[PDB]
Amino acid sequence: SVHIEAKQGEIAESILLPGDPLRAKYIAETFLEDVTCYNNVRGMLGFTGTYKGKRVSVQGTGMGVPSISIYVNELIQSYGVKNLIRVGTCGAIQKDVKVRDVIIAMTACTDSNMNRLTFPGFDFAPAANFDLLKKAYDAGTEKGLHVRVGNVLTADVFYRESMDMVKKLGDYGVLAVEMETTALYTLAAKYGVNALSVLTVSNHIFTGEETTSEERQTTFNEMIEIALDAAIQ
Amino acid sequence: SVHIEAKQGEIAESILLPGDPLRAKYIAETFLEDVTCYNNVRGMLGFTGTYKGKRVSVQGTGMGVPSISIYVNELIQSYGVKNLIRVGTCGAIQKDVKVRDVIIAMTACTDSNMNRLTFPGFDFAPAANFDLLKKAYDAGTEKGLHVRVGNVLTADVFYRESMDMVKKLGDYGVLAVEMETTALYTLAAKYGVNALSVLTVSNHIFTGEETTSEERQTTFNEMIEIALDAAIQ
Amino acid sequence: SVHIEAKQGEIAESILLPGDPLRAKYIAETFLEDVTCYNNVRGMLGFTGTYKGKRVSVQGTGMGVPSISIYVNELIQSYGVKNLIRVGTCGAIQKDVKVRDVIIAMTACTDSNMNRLTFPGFDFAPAANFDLLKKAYDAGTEKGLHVRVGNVLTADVFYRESMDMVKKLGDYGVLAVEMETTALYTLAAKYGVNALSVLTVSNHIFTGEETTSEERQTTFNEMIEIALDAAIQ
Amino acid sequence: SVHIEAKQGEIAESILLPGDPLRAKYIAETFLEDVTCYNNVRGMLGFTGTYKGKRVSVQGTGMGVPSISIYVNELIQSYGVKNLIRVGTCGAIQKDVKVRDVIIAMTACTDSNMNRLTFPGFDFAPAANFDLLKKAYDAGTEKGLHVRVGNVLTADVFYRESMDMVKKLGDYGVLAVEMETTALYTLAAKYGVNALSVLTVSNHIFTGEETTSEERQTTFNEMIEIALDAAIQ
Amino acid sequence: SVHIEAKQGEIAESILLPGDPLRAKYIAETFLEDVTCYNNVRGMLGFTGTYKGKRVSVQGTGMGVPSISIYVNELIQSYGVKNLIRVGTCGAIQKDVKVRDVIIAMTACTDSNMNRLTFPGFDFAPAANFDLLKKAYDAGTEKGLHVRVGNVLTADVFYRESMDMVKKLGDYGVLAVEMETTALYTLAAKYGVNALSVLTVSNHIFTGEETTSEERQTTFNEMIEIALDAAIQ
Amino acid sequence: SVHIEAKQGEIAESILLPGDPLRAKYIAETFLEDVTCYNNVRGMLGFTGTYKGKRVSVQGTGMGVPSISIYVNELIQSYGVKNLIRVGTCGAIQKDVKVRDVIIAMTACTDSNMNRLTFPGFDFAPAANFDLLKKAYDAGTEKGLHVRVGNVLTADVFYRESMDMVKKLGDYGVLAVEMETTALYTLAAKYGVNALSVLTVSNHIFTGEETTSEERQTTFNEMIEIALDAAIQ
Ligand SMILES: O=c1[nH]cnc2c1ncn2[C@@H]1O[C@H](CO)[C@@H](O)[C@H]1O
Ligand SMILES: O=c1[nH]cnc2c1ncn2[C@@H]1O[C@H](CO)[C@@H](O)[C@H]1O
Ligand SMILES: O=c1[nH]cnc2c1ncn2[C@@H]1O[C@H](CO)[C@@H](O)[C@H]1O
Numbered sequence A, B, C, D, E, F: 001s002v003h004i005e006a007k008q009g010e011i012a013e014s015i016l017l018p019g020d021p022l023r024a025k026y027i028a029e030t031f032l033e034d035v036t037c038y039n040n041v042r043g044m045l046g047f048t049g050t051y052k053g054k055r056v057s058v059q060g061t062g063m064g065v066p067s068i069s070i071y072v073n074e075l076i077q078s079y080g081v082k083n084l085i086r087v088g089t090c091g092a093i094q095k096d097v098k099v100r101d102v103i104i105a106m107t108a109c110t111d112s113n114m115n116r117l118t119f120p121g122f123d124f125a126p127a128a129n130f131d132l133l134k135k136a137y138d139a140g141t142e143k144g145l146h147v148r149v150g151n152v153l154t155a156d157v158f159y160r161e162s163m164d165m166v167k168k169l170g171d172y173g174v175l176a177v178e179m180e181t182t183a184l185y186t187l188a189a190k191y192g193v194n195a196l197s198v199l200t201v202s203n204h205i206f207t208g209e210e211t212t213s214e215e216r217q218t219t220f221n222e223m224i225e226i227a228l229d230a231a232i233q
């Protein structure tokens, strides 16, 4: 496809979608066997390998609705992918949400115009595939993680001048901010395939608490495991 | 409160919310013991009774976002209600969704302006309480119902001149149309309480299939049972 | 029709539209002769009778744009109704407007999306039928009421978190808030029939003054009389 | 003021507002006695004189919401004007509306953003002063004109690429298109003064019928008379 | 055309567009030879003459997007005009912008709805013809003027209740406010012809500094010269 | 900063901004001397080196408004960058625009919501720094390139279901589609620094013509040269 140099059949039907291509590399090296790298266009690494015997892929998406939309469209339309699980990080916008929690997004709010253009006059609420959601929830519960299932904000702006609306969304139960889920969930629904986002809380936007990769790695490793499990089912 | 004549403490913390007040009467008479009627203002019947030993209420809401918003605000703010389960009907907008299916709404799309006013420039995706959702899903699964968990449209207009956008929403996986869920889910989130909508598919909007109350009553009875169960937990 | 169980011909061509079905009952019992009840679906009472010798009907609408839109569509499209007069209550948003005033709405502002969906990019100003308006004005003037003719707000939300915009509308001459007129006037215009809203001011939103039904009943009775008069002409 | 060179007190409290400054000149010369010209800034002629003994003014506004808004703000805020009557022309968008009809605008629809900016999320329906409206209606009725009272479109674009929405507005009872009323009515309401628009239908937009000034002059003269009458009361 | 009484061929292919028709008269009398007046409809003077031997026209537009849109549509579509240069005034909204500066608009922001209607869901950025822009820039540079090339605001409202957004636009580099450029640039682009706006700063909106025509006339004369030069090339 | 691991002072005040980090590597290796790599976070390579003796940097941005906004905010606010030139590719949406043309964006249209959120009710037209624009134009003219200066579309969606609006924008003179310029120009203006986008046309969206990197490399090399030149001045 335009942004992926893989041949037909090189990408598995189940795929993990980190935003960072170097995290795709880490996931492939850490968890998968019999690994090939099928893409390095724009440095946006993608790999296929085996986990507990099943083929699976892992593909960086880049940051933001427009970037992930490019990759998700191509994966679905050109490579026949069926199950797509974003594995990422997010910033908590509730005191009750803690750094190192794992959030499974039921749905996402957004300040993107992508869906207002598609459905003029409507608020489109992009939804997770429930069967994948339940599988990940059950796997994370059994893995012993603090799993929260709820709403997130998919933001176009990482650096927002006023935080008033983000605070207000938090007061309406929105758990955390990230930059991709609306697009993944909307496009998967469009094409009749299955999507989920599973996120590690890496910082709290209003307390200023933050972590490096190393400082959240055990939780992050465990989260990848339950994303892979929800994939291989 | 302005629209409910009950005294403080007459309404239980868990409540079922049919749109039709005569369905509230049917539910109270059919399922509950030790029943009182606490409201007849505007004919919008409300009852409290016991089911398998636990107090519970049932309150008509009327039709549409503005009507249910009035009742939900008053129930939460004046009567201290904690768990709110809409029990209603809907029209399928997918061929794969069948009349007599039970839909549990994860989230809702809308053509209402209610949330655009509250969050200018954003698409707010109103979400179910996951713990209530899981309890209802498990109860309906065990009850032997065809349960579908997904997205619905909360419409302001029952009679829409063009169906183009409703068809398009169906192509993006939206299961059915109804007229209340956005408001229930948004207000419950605002106030930190727990909401869910559990709906019986009564007609298919694009095939013209339809049912009377009697023609869907066994399914509807079973749905009330699993809404009550998710309530008494 | 879907929400009205009347046979063809049971509903008169001229109809009064209170929001409260129990007010429809009161109006029929108090003012009409030879009364039949033609509907009790959803408890949304409707009656036909005679006033000073002419057939007329009275039909509850419920609260809010979506509810009244259902009834008005069915009345016009399935029952051939020609003259529709909402008879209701409202909350004043001007100090100069007094409780027990009667407001005849020339037009209505709204926070509903109903017309933005129909006319993308435009502000649709829903207008009263002038001939009905003049007849009601003349009848109320002769009846000795304080009649104010002007603009109202048709609100989707009864409980608004911030009142800033309602105050601002008051500063631009908007007289009172209610929850139905935009829909009645828009739909009547769509179908080429005649509509009017005639409202009793029951409270002042910024002074906190309020009334019970009994405390405004003489004014309310007189208002029904001039709505009926504007109907029988 | 910035756009009017008159001294304080040179402009009467009642004023007619044609769009064309040469029509202001015609009105002053044809109907008024003891006439002064108080403005020629930008060629936007304004005059004060006497009609049946009462002082009155007549001021061109130019075409479009932004132009008339400039003049109306200055007249109200700098010159203390109290009663403002636009006297203009319009294009019919209904077959039932005829060239040479006089339309008295109850309210106006618009494709302008002026009110969406002022009232975010709301549709503001700009309304005529009813007392002035009734006075003009009664005067036109007695004068023997075909007077229509209803809704108009205030357009930003005279040359619209697609007429679909103008046709649709006609199907919802909107009588004619012009380019000023929304602004006049909104600003008068803002400042607590009295406004009305009284328009001669000069063309039918969908039949192509049209008139020159001379071809509608008797009707136009009669309309000025009843605008002046509604002014001097 | 509807608003211009000229015969075919009476208007030159290159035209200057002041807002004030009396400025069109001043420009023709001051700079042109062999002058004819081809229009006085609505007092909106238009002239054709010769400058340094080349035919050119000058046409008042009136104030605001709707007024200039009428004239620009007719000039382009009925009179075959090819090069259109608005010559006007503006109010500075930056301290760094000085009264008597000449601004050449690259593009324009707006609070008009004109382009949102044409391109639903998009922000259309109306752009100058670069070749004309460069010619005017070079001519003004050589003439010894303080020329600033940048962004302006095309406003619908001259009298804005809150200046917050105008201040904010200034903080994003917008130089000045005027009332026509969006429309000129958009329509010229639509029809494949060449437009530019060249403006004299006449006042500073936040310091209150202001000028009369006489007080900026030398600069204004020099600006007309470089607009004419960019025209005759 | 959060997404760039460079120390203070490692990034030059003038910077080129390709979307593809591997193009940043190519630019540094091909054109610069004394090169350091200061960033590999997320694989988003950034380099500093010397060109004709002046320090300069080159930093990948990723694809889309949200991605480039992250990098541009950090470069400006944390690293003190002053001159930012996007060097990228685009798809032509005019027949008159040819593959291998170089477009210098004066301004950009968008379907992003980023500026509607910042300036509610307004169309913000993001503008290039004119001084940088002129320097690049002059350099490209002297280099012998086909340089077009005009408007572009900054799109959120690479894969758009309907092309109707893109075609319409082309009919209004918009030259090409890309995915970053609105954000670069808006943020540079916010912070008072200088930005430009210089793009090679790599494909024609409506003819299907396309190129590989190798097939446009001579033009692309020449474009980098004139972006660097406009930088070192
Ligand atoms: O606090 C946050 N705000 C926005 N995005 C975040 C946050 N935390 C993690 N991400 C995620 O990391 C990238 C941006 O750095 C995006 O991919 C986003 O989804
Ligand atoms: O097909 C449908 N469209 C809209 N609402 C429906 C449909 N089916 C059931 N409801 C539900 O019944 C009432 C309206 O009659 C509303 O309360 C709505 O939620
Ligand atoms: O102050 C008010 N706000 C909103 N609606 C009102 C008010 N007063 C009367 N109504 C009317 O009563 C119902 C809501 O209780 C609605 O039908 C509305 O039209």
Ligand SMILES: O=c1[nH]cnc2c1ncn2[C@@H]1O[C@H](CO)[C@@H](O)[C@H]1O
Pocket (backbone or CB within 6 Å): D019, D062, D063, D064, D088, D089, D090, D091, D092, D155, D158, D177, D178, D179, D180, D202, D203, D205
């Ligand atoms: O058909 C019409 N469309 C738009 N405006 C019209 C029409 N007829 C009359 N006017 C009026 O004349 C000026 C424009 O020529 C505007 O002032 C408008 O109000």
Ligand SMILES: O=c1[nH]cnc2c1ncn2[C@@H]1O[C@H](CO)[C@@H](O)[C@H]1O
Pocket (backbone or CB within 6 Å): E019, E062, E063, E064, E088, E089, E090, E091, E092, E155, E158, E177, E178, E179, E180, E202, E203, E205
């Ligand atoms: O400060 C200003 N605000 C708005 N428009 C201005 C300003 N200065 C000059 N103009 C210009 O003059 C007319 C309005 O008086 C308009 O044509 C506008 O473009």
Ligand SMILES: O=c1[nH]cnc2c1ncn2[C@@H]1O[C@H](CO)[C@@H](O)[C@H]1O
Pocket (backbone or CB within 6 Å): F019, F062, F063, F064, F088, F089, F090, F091, F092, F155, F158, F177, F178, F179, F180, F202, F203, F205
């Ligand atoms: O035809 C096009 N549409 C959208 N973006 C394009 C096109 N051609 C080049 N780009 C540019 O390349 C990346 C997307 O592949 C984006 O960075 C965009 O700016």
